[PDB]
Design a protein around this ligand. Structure first.
Ligand SMILES: [Mg+2]
Ligand SMILES: [Zn+2]
Ligand SMILES: [Zn+2]
Ligand SMILES: [Zn+2]
Ligand SMILES: [Zn+2]
Ligand SMILES: [Zn+2]
Lengths: 109, 74, 198, 46, 301, 96, 144, 48, 97
RNA sequence: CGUCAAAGCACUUUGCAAAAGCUAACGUAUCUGUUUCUUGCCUUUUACCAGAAACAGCCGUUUGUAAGGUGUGCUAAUUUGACUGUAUAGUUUUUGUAAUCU
């Protein structure tokens, strides 16, 4: 809560001391909680969600090393096509006990 | 502002973006036996969510991690 | 190559962001919906599986199940308020229930047309007087109707019987033509221009 | 004094109605060199 | 160094992100609006309280503009509409319809002429009473910001392409473009004299262009770094000082950037919790206005 | 008709009217009609030249009236709205 | 819902499709009585599966094969033989194969997000391709 | 006779319906009555 | 005839079949174009005479013109409080972490 | 019915706010509780008896407004509001007793 708006060039803000050497790596960091520094941030939901999904995808790709994919518009349909091909057919409703019994979203693989 | 729980990054997952819930007064500290809020998060996909086990008064007197009960220095 | 693909992708990303921020039906990026009704078999199965709560499979729900005792009298009032009237064999009620199966509030108010209600009950008056005159041997129901240690009645075999018939005057075909088709309904004129709506 | 006493009074009075207050809060979080290792990247948590 | 009671005044209100906040040309009022579909009118001097709320808009106030008369308010809505709000009485004067998507920016004229762009890849000129677009310009890609010269023949439109196009309303000859940007242009602003054009782009570079019929090529005067854009693709504004010697911009790193228009950064003052959407300067004194997506706006020096 | 209503309002007062001849009439209006036929009393006729004559009872046909000078205090008379079917401006309480 | 022998006879096309609706009710009773082998929420999935199947049968009768008149279809929706809101969702783009209405509502989730079955599988990792906890759905996405 | 006092509309069931713990459906009245009787019996038994 | 309504309470000069001109404030008109003028002055031939409240015949009227324009927000929820800017130690976009 | 204007409209879910101003049914219906008094029955408390005053609670109602849902539309449907709303060359105004000069 600095109260005086001030030009930039004097923002280096030095501590101006002999740099106490007794401190160890735990206290070199400024923190509120014991573990670290935490502060509020007004992130809209969509950006957080999309970049979080991106990070999770990267983690899975690193773990499984299966990262050989691209991204596009018709590419989206093309990737859906192979997975849909591996899926078995959804049955027809009004057929209930086997031999084409309807299973829609519950169709297995 | 009762902002955040002290949790080590070993059990906070290797993802830089996590989602976690808090329910005030939902538990008693396992040392203080004082009311305390739980924080539940997912360390990684394919794992049961973790949760804090002690209040913030503890893990301050003990310099420890509220979830995995390990000291934050050693 | 180059410019057309780069600009199409850039516009795609920009317009996706715009859809997220200012979607047609989105509040904060998610599509708004309404809390819908579950099939009645859901609650039927919940109540059958819970049973007498004598299983460890549900021992996590006992605290809430017992905490609903505070709201039980409200459920009693809402249930008694919607008792079926003599002229109707059965009444379907919009109900509100805990997912635990702990409590079950009949979420309705018995809203009626006042002249219609008075007419129906006057009809009941005449029919009951006629039957008490004509029966010549009236066997009153015994109380309590069910024996003390009897298990509670299973709904499974209550839904298979024909619901018998109720007290209904034989309305004349031409004298009572205006009120023939809806006199003994529950919500009489819901779909006609005589009532604003449901 | 009015503000302080009013705050205490409101807290006391609050102790049957169902509470309805749900809204996400985002926290930008900075790890601090716990067990040596290599610190960690900055994190934001919902 | 002004008539403000306190040098810094944090302003609370709104229930969602605030997207725009512009000073009255007289310098005594200013209005703000955002995702809560409400516009609030403020008092620059005095108690700094609300005297009016502009209710009725059925969408987010993407942008709004003050009138020279300082009595009517034009608002840009995400619901594909442009409403004219009578500031003194707070009643809906007219609702200009005709776009086919979210209308991103808005600008007014020195004469009763309105201009706007929307995601339907079009720009429309509106008379204050005709209730219909007098002129329509159709582009390939969605447009994001406009600025009209107060002389009254040139409009600058900026969109996905990354090249500012200068359109002459009467001539319909468009063969002059201010190239130089390489990403989406969030905002444009014209100088008080109408001689220079200020642009912000999502390639993180704020550039300044000259609006003159003749140029010595490389119309690019100078470029500015530091003001950066986040991943939310927000439309961050740029501002012109009253004396037109300081240029300002907002950034998604919660910092307000003020320059001297000569290439040296002057103010980098922080203070916001989220992305800083809009920024403006008072026309009389040395105040600065901040507008951020953290439900708050700040008054300046 | 609001003008005819004001003329009826005038009844009982002293109104001056001049006819297509140019002569002005100073007397008390006692009757009026929708056609603006007028009845007057104690009239002082000022001819076009300026000669002053006097009449007692007249029935001026309305088609030959140029204008009338109504007494000033009638400027506050109420102008009621007239619906389609109504032929007289009166306070209304029904639909319109 | 339930109909007596003295009730107003249903429209003409009812008797051809009565037996299959009775069979739907039969399996609903069987699912109600069958107990065990699941968590507190897992045992309640076949209910939603069968409800979706029955409503989809009626929707198929009307909108794709035109085997029933509109009067009978409106009657069926009125007598709760089919879910009106679920059919309304099926009739609009993006929700052609919606499993149930609990996997679309965002107020029933922890983080205000729709269910996992709604995400297209091309954008989903191989590990997190599981059965939905609400109803056992295995992918509602219209693409899949 | 007291002239009714002004107050904003509040109702327990709407507040309960807002939560995720309560769902809604349409059942026969007798089934609902049997359910209420059974639930009250179970609550009293658990309290005993 | 909606334009005829717009001249009420205005000041009008009416040139007449006789050749005179009346100037005054319009109070009410008629389907036969009977005009009611308040505080009316007579322009003979120009000599000024105060006339007062005047009802014109429809036939008498030739043309008319106007000489003068017709005679003649609740609250908000925001609240201001002084505050200072708090410098954060981070330099990163809100989206990026 | 007609003209003009703006609002998609009908049904419906939820949130927020308000509901006597000029003596008058928010509810043509009707319960409970607390405090302070006066009573009844009374061995002491709860539970009680029945009248008053001052307060509260619960079951409901109406309106405004905000965001949604369903069914139908925007290649029109409906609603709300406003309106100095109608014919007519044959004497009482608008299909000319005018021009001529003075
Ligand atoms: Mg004792
Ligand atoms: Zn830990
Ligand atoms: Zn503790
Ligand atoms: Zn589902
Ligand atoms: Zn699901
Ligand atoms: Zn699903």
């Amino acid at each position: 809560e600095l109260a005086r708006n001030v030009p930039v060039n004097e923002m280096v803000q030095p501590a101006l001391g002999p740099a106490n050497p007794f401190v160890t790596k735990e206290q070199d960091s400024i923190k509120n909680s014991i573990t670290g520094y935490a502060e509020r941030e007004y992130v809209p939901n969509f950006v957080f969600n999309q970049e979080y999904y991106a990070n999770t995808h990267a983690i899975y790709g690193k773990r499984n090393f299966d990262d050989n994919e691209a991204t596009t518009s018709t590419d989206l349909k093309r990737k859906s096509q192979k997975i849909k091909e591996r899926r078995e057919d959804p049955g027809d409703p009004s057929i209930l006990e086997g031999d084409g019994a309807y299973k829609g979203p519950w169709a297995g693989y | 502002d009762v902002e955040f729980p002290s949790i080590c990054e070993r059990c906070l997952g290797d993802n830089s973006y996590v989602r976690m819930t808090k329910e005030p007064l939902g538990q008693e500290c396992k040392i203080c036996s004082k009311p305390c809020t739980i924080f539940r998060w997912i360390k990684e996909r394919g794992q049961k969510p973790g949760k804090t086990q002690i209040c913030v008064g503890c893990a301050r007197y003990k310099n420890c991690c509220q979830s995995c009960m390990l000291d934050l220095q050693f | 190559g180059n410019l057309e693909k780069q600009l199409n992708e850039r516009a795609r990303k920009w317009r996706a962001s715009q859809k997220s921020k200012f979607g047609v039906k989105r509040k904060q990026g998610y599509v708004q919906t309404e809390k819908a009704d579950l099939p009645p078999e859901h609650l039927r199965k919940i109540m059958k599986d819970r049973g007498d709560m004598s299983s460890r499979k549900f021992r996590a729900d006992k605290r809430s199940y017992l905490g609903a005792l505070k709201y039980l009298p409200h459920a009693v009032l809402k249930l008694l308020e919607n008792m079926p009237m003599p002229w109707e064999e059965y009444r379907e009620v919009k109900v509100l229930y805990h997912v635990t199966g702990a409590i079950t509030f009949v979420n309705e108010s018995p809203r009626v047309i006042e002249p219609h209600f008075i007419a129906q009950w006057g009809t009941m008056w005449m029919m009951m007087r006629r039957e008490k005159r004509d029966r010549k041997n009236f066997k009153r129901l015994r109380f309590p109707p069910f024996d003390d240690e009897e298990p509670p009645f299973s709904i499974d075999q209550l839904l298979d019987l024909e619901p018998l018939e109720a007290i209904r005057m034989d309305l004349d075909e031409e004298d009572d033509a205006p009120v023939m088709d809806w006199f003994y309904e529950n919500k009489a004129l819901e779909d006609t221009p005589h009532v604003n709506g449901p | 004094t009015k503000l302080a006493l009013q705050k205490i009074l409101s807290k006391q009075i609050a102790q049957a109605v169902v509470q309805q207050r749900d809204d996400p809060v985002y926290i930008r979080y900075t790890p601090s060199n716990q067990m040596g290792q290599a610190l960690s990247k900055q994190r934001i948590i919902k | 160094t002004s008539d403000l009671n306190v040098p810094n005044l944090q302003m609370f209100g709104h229930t969602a992100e605030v997207l725009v906040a512009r000073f009255d040309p007289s310098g005594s009022y200013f209005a703000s609006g955002g995702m809560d579909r409400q516009i609030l009118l403020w008092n620059v001097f005095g108690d700094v309280k609300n005297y009016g709320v502009l209710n009725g808009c059925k969408g987010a106030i993407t942008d709004l503009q003050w009138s020279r008369d300082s009595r009517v308010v034009y608002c840009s809505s995400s619901d594909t509409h442009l409403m004219s709000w009578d500031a003194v009485s707070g009643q809906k004067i007219r609702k200009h319809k005709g776009h086919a998507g979210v209308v991103n920016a808005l600008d007014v004229l020195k004469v009763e002429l309105l201009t706007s762009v929307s995601d339907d890849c079009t720009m429309k000129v509106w008379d204050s009473r005709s209730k219909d677009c007098i002129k329509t310009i159709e582009e390939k890609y969605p447009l994001t910001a406009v600025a009209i010269a107060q002389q009254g023949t040139q409009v600058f439109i900026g969109g996905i392409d990354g090249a500012i196009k200068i359109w002459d309303l009467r001539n319909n000859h468009c063969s002059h473009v201010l190239k130089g940007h390489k990403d989406i242009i969030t905002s444009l602003a014209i100088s008080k004299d109408g001689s220079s054009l200020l642009s912000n782009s999502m390639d993180n570079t704020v550039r300044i262009f000259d609006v003159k019929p003749f140029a010595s090529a490389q119309r690019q005067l100078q470029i500015f770094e530091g003001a950066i854009h986040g991943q939310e693709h927000n439309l961050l504004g740029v501002a012109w000082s009253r004396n037109s010697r300081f240029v300002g911009a907002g950034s998604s790193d919660k910092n307000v950037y003020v320059w001297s228009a000569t290439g040296d950064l002057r103010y980098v003052l922080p203070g916001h919790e989220g992305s800083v959407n809009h920024v403006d300067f008072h026309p009389h004194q040395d105040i600065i206005l901040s507008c951020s997506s953290d439900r708050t706006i700040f008054l300046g020096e | 008709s609001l003008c005819i209503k004001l003329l009826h309002e005038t009844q009982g007062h002293i109104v001056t009217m001049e006819l297509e001849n140019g002569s002005t009439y100073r007397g008390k209006l006692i009757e009026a009609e929708d056609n603006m036929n007028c009845q007057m009393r104690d009239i002082s006729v000022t001819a076009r030249d300026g000669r002053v004559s006097h009449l007692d009872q007249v029935y001026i046909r309305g088609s030959h009236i140029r204008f009338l000078i109504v007494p000033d205090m009638l400027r506050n008379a109420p102008m009621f709205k007239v619906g389609p079917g109504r032929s007289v401006p009166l306070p209304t309480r029904g639909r319109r | 819902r339930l109909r007596t022998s003295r009730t107003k006879r249903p429209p003409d096309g009812f008797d051809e499709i009565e037996p299959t609706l009775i069979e739907f009710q039969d399996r609903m009773r069987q699912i109600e009585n069958t107990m065990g082998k699941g968590t507190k929420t897992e045992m309640l999935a076949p209910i939603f599966q069968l409800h979706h199947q029955r409503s989809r049968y009626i929707y198929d009768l009307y909108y794709k094969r035109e085997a029933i008149s509109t009067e009978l279809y409106n009657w069926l929706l009125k007598q709760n033989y089919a879910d009106g809101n679920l059919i309304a969702k099926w009739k609009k783009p993006g929700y052609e194969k919606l499993c149930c209405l609990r996997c679309i509502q965002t107020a029933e989730s922890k983080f205000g997000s729709t269910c996992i079955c709604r995400v297209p599988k091309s954008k989903l990792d191989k590990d997190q391709r599981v059965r939905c906890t609400h109803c056992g759905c295995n992918g509602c996405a219209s693409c899949d | 006779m007291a002239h009714p006092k002004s107050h904003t509309n509040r109702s327990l069931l709407r507040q309960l319906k807002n939560t995720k713990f309560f769902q809604s459906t349409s059942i026969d009245w007798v089934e609902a009555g049997l359910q209420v009787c059974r639930q009250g019996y179970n609550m009293l038994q658990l309290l005993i | 005839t909606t334009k005829m309504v717009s001249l009420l309470n205005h000041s009008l000069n009416v040139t007449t079949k006789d050749g005179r001109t009346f100037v005054g404030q319009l109070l009410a008109f008629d389907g036969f174009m009977n005009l009611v003028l308040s505080d009316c002055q007579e322009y003979r031939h120009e000599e000024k005479r105060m006339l007062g409240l005047v009802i014109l015949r429809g036939e008498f009227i030739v043309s008319l013109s106007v000489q003068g324009p017709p005679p003649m927000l609740l609250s908000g929820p925001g609240v201001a409080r002084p505050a200072g800017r708090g410098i954060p130690l981070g330099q990163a976009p809100v989206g990026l972490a």
